[PDB]
């Protein structure tokens, strides 16, 4: 009652070619880290360059859960992307009322989990999964967001 305040989240994976459902209801760490930079390139010749937009760009994401989804995991037990659709909500500070929802969409995700998390004591599950945002050579992709607050 005194002080702390927290929140929640919601994660929603999906494998392409169909609406395959794998998801996590929460993401506590959920460390999201965008990143843009540049170091060096270009031949610096030909006088007029007539362009330049190089910005590499890449996204990092993190999730915790223990719900790999109950049936087809066991189905395959015995590479069509892993697109995720993040969702959450936002509130107006003046009224503190739930008035807006937020959806975040990623079209092409590639999982790269460090497969050496062998720890030394029996842990409380928490198999943290980290994700990379991938793009073909076509167009668009990465980030598209849906936003409520129609009031």
């Amino acid at each position: 009652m005194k002080t702390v305040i927290q929140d929640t989240a919601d994660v929603y994976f999906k494998r392409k070619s169909d609406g395959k459902l794998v998801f996590t209801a929460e993401a506590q760490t959920a460390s999201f880290s965008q990143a843009i930079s540049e170091e060096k390139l270009r031949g610096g010749i030909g006088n007029k360059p007539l362009y330049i937009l190089k910005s590499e760009k890449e996204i990092n994401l993190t999730v915790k859960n223990a719900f790999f989804d109950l049936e087809w995991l066991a189905m395959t037990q015995g590479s069509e992307r892993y697109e995720v659709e993040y969702r959450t909500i936002a509130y107006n500070p003046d009224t503190e009322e739930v008035y807006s929802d937020i959806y975040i969409q990623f079209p092409n995700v590639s999982p790269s989990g460090e497969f050496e998390m062998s720890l030394e004591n029996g842990n409380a599950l928490a198999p943290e999964i980290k994700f990379e945002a991938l793009a073909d050579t076509d167009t668009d992709e990465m980030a598209v967001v849906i936003e409520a607050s129609r009031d």
């Binding site: 702390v4 927290q6 929140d7 929640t8 989240a9 929460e26 993401a27 506590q28 760490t29 959920a30 460390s31 999201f32 880290s33 965008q34 990143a35 990092n60 959450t88």
Partner: peptide, 15 residues
Amino acid sequence: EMSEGSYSFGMSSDI
């Protein structure tokens, strides 16, 4: 988290 510019939903590592 500081060195990368990341963000945190849910319960952050500081609370």
